[PDB]
Amino acid sequence: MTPEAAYQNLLEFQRETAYLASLGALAAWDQRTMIPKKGHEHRARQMAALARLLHQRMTDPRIGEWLEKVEGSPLVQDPLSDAAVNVREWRQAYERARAIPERLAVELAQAESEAESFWEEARPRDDWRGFLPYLKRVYALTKEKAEVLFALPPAPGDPPYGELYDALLDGYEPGMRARELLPLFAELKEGLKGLLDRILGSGKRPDTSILHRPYPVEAQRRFALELLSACGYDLEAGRLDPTAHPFEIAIGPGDVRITTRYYEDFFNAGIFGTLHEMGHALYEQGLPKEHWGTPRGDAVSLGVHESQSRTWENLVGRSLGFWERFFPRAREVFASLGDVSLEDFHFAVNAVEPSLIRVEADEVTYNLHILVRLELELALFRGELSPEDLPEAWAEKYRDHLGVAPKDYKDGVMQDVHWAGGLFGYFPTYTLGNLYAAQFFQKAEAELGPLEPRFARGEFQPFLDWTRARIHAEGSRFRPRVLVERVTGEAPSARPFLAYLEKKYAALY
């Protein structure tokens, strides 16, 4: 067959798999939003049937046959062309999938699912003892998956693996290596320590009490919907619904949904939860629709995805400019803000404090939470730490990095579900998101001029369009590291982030 014919069959086959996965995405969305209480068991079974189908498709030998027919042909001479990008990414995903033995894939998936299930009820019981076995099983299998992927060559163009852990990192942040991460965190950790010194020793203290007053949930929903359309989220191609844990899911072109958790006596959850998810949504809604279902039209990495969510949640959402625009409106919507000034409110929503729970941590201490997890993970995969000693290491790490230590498993080593889910080499992407968010922003202001005054006028479209043309439109055409460098002109760094934190908090504390 001709290369064009092989490419088309590969294109059709691969998009068919994506359409099929998107039905799973809809089911996943439904499960966290509308599914009836007694429909969970059936849902799990639907997902498992789908998972088996998708796994079969992702390892179908024909993929390799067609690829070989296209690779090396004139269709992909230009590595930047849509065809070469798709073929290159398809080959890598194909190789990664086939590298993992059947039983390994089956065991790992089952272990994660079971660990997650037991964890859901174990954490509230502070039952580490009962949970450990499930965790070790997931860990042992993950280490095995990593050893297999580590013995194999990286993706063409990517740097060699420096250690087995890089094989896991690579899966979530294509091309990232521990030797590149470590120095970024070193810079970040030092800067955050210097800043926390100033803040903790400051006489100024925000009045967070204002954020815990009454905020009618139906009102929060209305306010959220207004901020959503104001920022540029297309409600004709998405929707906002309440859920236990906020998330964003893209079903397909013209259908990207977001959710948030509202608390009647906590303003932040519902509102910033919305802006956070909206950031992910804007990225998905910005991807080239004509390329949906192919690598060219896919988001490039978790780090870049998190840079878009943090950008709108924090760089935009907690900025003074943003609130000069929306604070008066919030004053009209929420009675609890009657005797509150813009200054007090803006200070309160940016309150800093070392705490125990990562998901609730403020901008400044947040990444210290990630550093803890990263160091623990490295020690694990380097054979320096045992799963049995996680609790002790965790408490000591927290005390050392945040100045506060857990008093139980519940709010300590058992707070996140990630490890139960087999998500190792995942946590660092959150930090990468914050660092990239600031780098992109610095470049955006240099080309568009200060954004604050525009936000103050409700002018978010110029900035949004910018992220579309420079980031969203590119899909997975470039490795995340290369994308950051092409847009900002500099390789990833922690400085723009630190510079951003310093300015904003120097003014607050």
Next chain:
Amino acid sequence: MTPEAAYQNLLEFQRETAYLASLGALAAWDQRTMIPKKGHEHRARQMAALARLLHQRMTDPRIGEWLEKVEGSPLVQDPLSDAAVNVREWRQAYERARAIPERLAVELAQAESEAESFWEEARPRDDWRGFLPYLKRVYALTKEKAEVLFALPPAPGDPPYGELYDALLDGYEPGMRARELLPLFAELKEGLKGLLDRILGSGKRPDTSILHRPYPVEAQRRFALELLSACGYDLEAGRLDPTAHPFEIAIGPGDVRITTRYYEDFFNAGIFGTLHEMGHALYEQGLPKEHWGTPRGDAVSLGVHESQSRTWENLVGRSLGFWERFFPRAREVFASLGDVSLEDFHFAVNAVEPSLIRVEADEVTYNLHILVRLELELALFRGELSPEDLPEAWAEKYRDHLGVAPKDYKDGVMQDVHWAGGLFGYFPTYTLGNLYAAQFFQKAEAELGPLEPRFARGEFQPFLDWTRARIHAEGSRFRPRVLVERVTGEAPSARPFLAYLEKKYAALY
């Protein structure tokens, strides 16, 4: 390979397909309820992607190999066994799937998707000239499907096909033929004609104006939810959502959903729409969960399904006892009813009047609407009527059967989406439903004693449990006609229904 092993592989493979198909059900539910405005084009492509996959599974030659091993074996010696039931039905579905060319199924699915889309826009418009081309395509492809299935022997034990049309009827009502339908309709036509006359010459007149007063939609929802739980609908295994066209869909065990459509100025639609879909849902919630994804656990036919919906909407929902029980509540929820008596309200929701719109038709005239469609469909497939001459035939048919005819297309041949969706040989099942409902209800009262008093007390579980044990639990163990006879002891007849109507309206009018 022993016959047991064959049956085991078949069961597992067929249920897997069931699970995958249920993802499509969730997509169809979402498409009519939560989908964003711009997500429709993607959803249609998702449906087509799933269809391609399912077709492959449904025609997998392994199904034939396994079926041959099990047929004639000890596993199916007992015709009423779970195994025999499933094997019999799987062979029939397998032969059907293989008979219909993949290209016809695809083209037909596309012709319907397009015909429906253009329709819902061409109906509000009196555009029949624009819709006709789309209808003719769907019709042409539907006739081809009929011809393919018609050239094949019917399912074993079923009577032979008497004409092309029966091949279509069989798909919705396994075993039903125009042969048995006509005598039922002639009977029905004779009975309805006379009752409508008595009602017209009647000096009693219902105050329908009451139903057109204001009825806050939120109050309507809260009221609907009360009726649902009070009747036995498990809201923890389902949900109620607004939609453009009320329907019900079973996602899986523990997840059966319904929808309705409220009109601020019209009581009936939202309330009786809810009860109607509930009857469908009660059936699904009553099917044997252990046999889900298996013929043995599937609903038997649209007629039996519709008998359940009309049972709760009318037989229960529009009865005197039902309202003696809930009118006081209604009186309390809606101010418009503040000055209304139970007798007047009950008379109102049972008002009879020949009209043009089928879905708005009353108990007595409703089936005449179905008669018109059947005669037309028979004329079309018998080659005695051309789709271009449907408007004229529609008018004539209506005047003769109902005494009133459409003056346009909007409220004429274009009122139902059915023909655009390719639902031919479907309408007759609505009448079987009303007939079966009357027959089922009769046996029920005989064995349970007068139900009016129980309904008056809100005691519906006994009647519901009866339907579960006698109808829902059987799944598709028996052909629909046999199911009716085994439960009621009588063959399908229009007399129990006519007896029901004559007794009810002789009292009202």
